[PDB]
Design a protein around this ligand. Structure first.
Ligand code: HEM
Length: 291
């Protein structure tokens, strides 16, 4: 497969900034979702799962084709709970019927991170909706009960190196786990809809205890009422991962710059951009626009 980015016919920067604004105004408005966490965290989880299916070996999966719209991918067990972010974005797609699905699903994750005070993420338009038979089979997304060796190997398929894996994993300061979606339950920390380096500080400073939960899965629980997935607690057991965790725990600006680069790479894997194509867009937040 080659997947060439094609801009939506006739659309420029300001068209896309209007779609960003619609998502951002609806995030402000629907603030009650999930006990007042809001839709921000489930929207960056949606942008990572439609991107996370990519296989570097045959160029299949990834964000390009917007295939989460099809039943197979939509009903993937690993995607349970993401229907909420889909339903959030659906009125915005009736409003801007010209945007492709992969562009809208990835822009929703960019808008959520920046509206939750995260770094600016450069974004490129040009994904093209591909057919129902290009939809990847279930099972390409990662397990939660594994170790640092599994993590390294998994992310090699999306060719992410150690630093990019540790930067991307910082998104787990956002939102929470839900027992009915994944067999895990509890918040990651205290500031769950503000983008910060809290994941790393918690990993290095809490007194974590291993326990079984009500679904019979193990998780790490701390005295503060926070939890950690086994795959994510793995990052302090590997010496390479642990030196990068400590770097981000001490320097939130370094974490923001690295997360920005890594998240854009994740949302663009598998897509070829011609050089006639527009440069990456940097969207203004609602606040910067006075809206
Ligand atoms: C090996 C890597 C990862 C595993 C095993 C994993 C697993 C999980 C699990 C089991 C949940 C909770 C699902 C639920 O019950 O609703 C979760 C939530 C979440 N994940 Fe990950 N994750 C991984 C990587 C990532 C990455 C790379 C991102 C984004 C860059 C990300 C962003 C999120 C966010 C924001 C949530 C919270 C969603 C909400 O509040 O509903 N995760 N993850």
């Amino acid at each position: 497969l080659v997947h060439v980015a094609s801009v939506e016919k006739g659309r420029s920067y300001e068209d896309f900034q209007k779609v960003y604004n619609a998502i951002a105004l609806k995030l402000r408005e629907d603030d009650e979702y999930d006990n007042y966490i809001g839709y921000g965290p489930v929207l960056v989880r949606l942008a990572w799962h439609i991107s996370g299916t990519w296989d570097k070996h045959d160029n299949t999966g990834g964000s390009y084709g917007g295939t989460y719209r099809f039943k197979k991918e939509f009903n993937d067990p690993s995607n349970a709970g993401l229907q909420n972010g889909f339903k959030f974005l659906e009125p915005i797609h009736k409003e801007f019927p010209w945007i492709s699905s992969g562009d809208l699903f990835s822009l929703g994750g960019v808008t959520a991170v920046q509206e939750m005070q995260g770094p600016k993420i450069p974004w490129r338009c040009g994904r093209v909706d591909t057919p129902e038979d290009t939809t990847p089979d279930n099972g390409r997304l990662p397990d939660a009960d594994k170790d640092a060796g599994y993590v390294r190997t998994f992310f090699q398929r999306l060719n992410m190196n150690d630093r990019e894996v540790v930067a991307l994993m910082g998104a787990h300061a956002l939102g929470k786990t839900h027992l009915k979606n994944s067999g895990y339950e509890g918040p990651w920390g205290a500031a769950n809809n503000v983008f910060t380096n809290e994941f790393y500080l918690n990993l290095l400073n809490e007194d974590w205890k291993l326990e079984k939960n009500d679904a019979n899965n193990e998780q790490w629980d701390s005295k503060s009422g926070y939890m950690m997935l086994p795959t994510a607690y793995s990052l302090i057991q590997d010496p390479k991962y642990l030196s990068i965790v400590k770097e981000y725990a001490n320097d939130q600006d370094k974490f923001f710059k690295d997360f920005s680069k890594a998240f854009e790479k994740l949302l663009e894997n598998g897509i070829t951009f011609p050089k006639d194509a527009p440069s990456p867009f940097i969207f203004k937040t609602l606040e910067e626009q006075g809206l």
